[PDB]
């Protein structure tokens, strides 16, 4: 099945270079290392599991570069347009740039370090004539795009019915009330398989609602010996990610006259999980995306990225104690407008 192809006003090699230059350059100097390299150092020390990319920072970086006279290709507009791809680009930039830890963490107890170290030893023996992994397996952090502050589409608080189909793929912010929330469940990122007949594990990255389990050992340790060894899934070596499904519903003021309040599924992953409770009135930024099940009609959901909620004592109580007439005034303060 062949495909036609077209030219577009974007170049991901160029934008990858723009992203990594930003990542090693920017800092909030008006507040007086680079902000993101400091945050990545905190990730290296495993003290922080979330990288929050600010579109405000990309705007200020663009403004600085434009003040220095170079074009900057408006990366903010690009990554508001097609945010899903740019999560992958930012993670590649981080997985290249991220520094070593400054603080020690008792590393030997980490299974993924042990298993990939054993792989590296075996591959050194192979390479001595006697990528190393899928990148998601080694990527401990989670990456999120924080919207533009009002000072543009990620900034605007749409109602759910204002999310027309034209906004698919875009980073948008939606205003509503959470009507129900799922219990947290483990989604797979990378499935890990032990091989019984050679020991050399293999991995499957999963990008979809469903996957097919591997059986025959694809590794050359088996395949070059044409040994049809058996793969068995292991939870311990697999990378799971915390997954949770929520549903947001448009508020009573957003519903037009005589319409039903429309609603939208929210998918929240990683550290951002269980930031949403039912009954919360909230602005949620996320990538609005489709999912195939109908035929050409689509299921659609919001991949959550950022959450904005709408809504000392043992000595401060002495303010009222010393203020006095406490019983009378506190009694009058029950429903104070009621005679």
């Amino acid at each position: 099945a062949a495909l036609p192809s077209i030219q577009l006003p974007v170049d991901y090699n160029n934008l990858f270079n723009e992203i990594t230059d930003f990542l090693v350059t920017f800092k909030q100097d008006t507040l007086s290392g680079p902000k993101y390299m400091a945050m990545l150092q905190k990730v290296a020390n495993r003290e922080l599991n979330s990288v929050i990319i600010d579109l405000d920072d990309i705007l200020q970086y663009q403004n600085e570069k434009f003040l220095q006279g170079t074009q900057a290709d408006d990366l903010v507009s690009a990554i508001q347009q097609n945010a899903n791809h740019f999560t992958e680009l930012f993670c590649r930039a981080i997985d290249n740039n991220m520094p070593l830890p400054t603080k020690e963490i008792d590393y030997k107890d980490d299974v993924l370090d042990v298993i990939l170290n054993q792989r590296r030893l075996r591959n050194e023996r192979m390479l001595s004539d006697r990528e190393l992994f899928p990148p998601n397996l080694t990527r401990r952090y989670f990456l999120y795009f924080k919207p533009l502050s009002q000072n543009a589409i990620s900034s605007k608080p749409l109602s759910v019915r204002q999310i027309k189909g034209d906004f698919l793929g875009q980073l948008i912010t939606v205003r509503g009330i959470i009507t129900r929330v799922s219990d947290v469940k483990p989604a797979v990122e990378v499935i890990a398989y032990t091989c019984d007949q050679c020991g050399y594990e293999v991995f499957q990255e999963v990008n979809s609602r469903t996957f097919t389990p591997l059986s025959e050992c694809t590794s050359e340790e088996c395949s070059q010996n044409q040994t049809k060894g058996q793969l068995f899934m292991s939870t311990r070596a697999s990378k799971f990610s915390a997954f949770q499904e929520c549903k947001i519903q448009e508020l009573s003021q957003q519903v037009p006259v005589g319409h039903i309040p429309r609603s939208l599924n929210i998918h929240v992953n990683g550290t951002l999980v269980r930031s949403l409770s039912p009954g919360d009135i909230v602005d949620v930024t996320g990538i609005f995306l489709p999912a195939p099940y109908a035929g050409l009609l689509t299921e659609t959901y919001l991949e959550a990225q950022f959450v904005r909620q709408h809504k000392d004592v043992e000595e401060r109580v002495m303010e009222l104690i010393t203020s006095g007439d406490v019983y009378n005034r506190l009694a009058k303060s029950i429903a104070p407008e009621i005679y």
Binding site: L3, P4, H85, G165, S252, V255, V257, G258, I260, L296
Partner: protein
């Protein structure tokens, strides 16, 4: 004959048409500059033109009849020519819409017939069972990670196109021809919004003893959500068939037919006997001129239901209920309702049902109900499975469909109490709450209920108290703004008056009919009255004022210190505010409070 050979000539003829009737060029440019301004100024007009089909006839009858009788071959060149016109304007495919004089192609879901398939038709009806809105995939774009090129794929189904192009299986690519792994690019990929609605035949038109027919309409992009259920509508579109109709041999059934649809091109809401009436400056000036007549409230209320004798205070209350007072929103989102809720309880044959039917014909948005015929679920909202997708979805009931309108309830005391238990939240909170089927929501039901009832006995018994005469609980009666008690009390003078009026009413003959042929002191007309109500609802929000407050507190304390309760006060405020709307006045004044107190005094005392 093959369509492509004539496409160019059809394009240039529609281009000559658009050049000739330059109002369409002006419309295209007006849309473009509006959208450019609103894009830069930091809400968007659609890329759609309504052409008067009469203009296209007067230009070229052959092309006009081509649009009507063969739209699959004549709308694509017309839309191409229109898109080229929009391209010729300074700095996306443009779509067409049609109006006027369809002739035999003006139909209903009954008389729409298999002979009409693939023709352009106009259907009048009432909307029901609107689907959820869903994005429909029409193009997907894919970055080939190693190759660097952006591959793409177009998609087709029988709804996306006027002609039966080969289907495309809705599969996303995953590999280049060389086997290189693709990644799908949302945001460059293209999706149209898609919605499926059922237009039902108007029950007034359906012949003797047959139930209304219905047909399904498809709406795309900006036509989506232009209607809700219960809207009376005219839809224009291409009537089509789709699917295999059982010809695919897995289906053994010989007799089933083909599925059929209208692919919609425009959607007009209706209340012709338009849902929102247009007002000329002549209408504005006449409406203001009448508002300065010193007794305008009497003129308008006498102009309500001119075929009903008497009942003057009820028609006054009805007028103020059509023009309810301003709704208040307060701290912590606390809420005070602005509807006026009326209950007519009384003897038989006292025009209670006829007054409900007049209100049903006069308000901008009214929903009829009857006590036995209404379920409590059928009143609030009902869970159903949307067969378009398979999900549980709410269907709006009468109270929700009447939001920012009115509800008429005849035979109200005949309701079962599990129905009336569902009335309470609408009256008390202007809302209904659902907590079933895993659906936990609250819906707006902001509307004036007007209801008709009889006492527990067949006629009102003046020997006994109102709570003993009237079936309803006090916990429901207290929620109505005005409780009217009417009686058919016998009196020769009143009987003579009402009788000669009713005989004049029954001696009517509509224009043009022969004598005895079957059908197929200043007062305003009902179209004028409907326009006046729309004007006053839209354009004036009366502000409360101390000179009115003085009258209100004086009257409230006097009424209470001789059934009266705290709720009576904001009822008086609502009645005064609505009478200020009758005066078209930015303020409520002492006159409004005096009339409000006089009318509520009539309702309470039988004054």
């Amino acid at each position: 004959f093959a369509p492509d050979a004539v496409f160019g000539d059809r394009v240039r003829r529609f281009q000559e048409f658009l050049d000739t009737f330059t109002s369409y060029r002006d419309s295209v440019r007006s849309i473009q500059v509006y959208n450019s301004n609103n894009a830069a100024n930091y809400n968007i007009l659609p890329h759609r033109i309504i052409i008067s089909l009469d203009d296209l006839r007067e230009f070229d009858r052959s092309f006009w009849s081509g649009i009507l009788v063969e739209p699959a071959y004549f709308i694509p060149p017309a839309e191409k020519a229109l898109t080229d016109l929009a391209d010729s304007m300074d700095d996306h495919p443009w779509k067409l819409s049609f109006k006027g004089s369809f002739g035999a192609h003006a139909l209903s879901p009954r008389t729409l017939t298999a002979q009409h398939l693939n023709k352009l038709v106009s259907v009048e009806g009432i909307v029901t069972k609107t689907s959820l809105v869903r994005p429909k995939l029409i193009r997907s774009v894919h970055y080939a990670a190693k190759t660097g090129r952006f591959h793409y794929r177009d998609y087709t189904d029988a709804t996306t196109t006027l002609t039966t192009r080969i289907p495309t299986p809705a599969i996303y690519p995953t590999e280049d021809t060389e086997g290189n792994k693709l990644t799908t690019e949302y945001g460059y990929s293209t999706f149209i919004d898609h919605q499926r609605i059922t237009v039902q035949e108007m029950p007034e038109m359906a012949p003797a003893g047959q139930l209304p027919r219905s047909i399904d309409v498809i709406l795309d992009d900006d036509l989506v959500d232009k209607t809700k259920p219960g809207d009376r509508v005219n839809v224009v579109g291409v009537f089509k068939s789709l699917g295999a109709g059982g010809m695919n041999q897995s289906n053994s059934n010989t007799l089933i037919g083909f599925k059929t649809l209208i692919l919609g091109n425009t959607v007009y809401p209706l209340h012709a006997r338009a849902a929102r009436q247009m007002l000329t400056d002549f209408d504005i000036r006449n409406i203001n001129k009448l508002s300065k007549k010193k007794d305008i409230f009497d003129i308008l209320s006498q102009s309500l239901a001119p075929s009903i004798y008497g009942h003057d205070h009820i028609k006054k209350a009805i007028l103020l209920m059509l023009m309810g007072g301003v709704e208040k929103n307060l701290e912590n989102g606390s809420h005070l309702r602005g509807d006026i809720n009326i209950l007519m309880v009384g003897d038989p044959s006292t025009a209670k049902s006829q007054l409900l039917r007049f209100v049903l014909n006069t308000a901008s948005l009214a929903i009829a109900t009857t006590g036995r015929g209404s379920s409590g679920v059928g009143l609030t909202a009902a869970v159903t499975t949307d067969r378009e997708t398979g999900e549980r979805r709410l269907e709006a009931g009468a109270m929700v469909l009447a939001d920012r309108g009115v509800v008429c309830i005849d035979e109200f005391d005949k309701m079962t109490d599990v129905d009336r238990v569902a009335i309470h939240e609408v009256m008390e909170q202007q809302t209904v709450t659902i907590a079933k089927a895993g659906i936990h929501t609250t819906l707006n039901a902001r509307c004036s209920v007007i209801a008709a009832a009889n006492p527990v006995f067949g006629q009102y018994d003046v020997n006994r108290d109102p709570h003993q005469n009237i079936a309803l609980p006090d916990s429901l009666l207290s929620r109505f703004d005005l409780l009217f008690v009417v009686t058919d009390d016998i009196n020769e003078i009143r009987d003579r008056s009402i009788s000669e009026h009713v005989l004049r009413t029954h001696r009517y003959l509509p224009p043009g009919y022969l004598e005895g042929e079957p059908v197929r002191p200043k007062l305003v007309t009902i179209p004028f009255l409907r326009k006046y109500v729309q004007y006053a609802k839209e354009r004036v929000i009366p502000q409360l004022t101390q000179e009115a407050i003085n009258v209100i507190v004086k009257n409230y304390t006097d009424l209470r210190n001789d059934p009266i309760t705290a709720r009576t006060l904001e009822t008086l405020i609502r009645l005064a505010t609505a009478h200020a709307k009758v005066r078209l006045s930015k303020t409520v004044n002492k006159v409004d409070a005096k009339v409000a107190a006089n009318l509520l005094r009539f309702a309470l005392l039988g004054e």
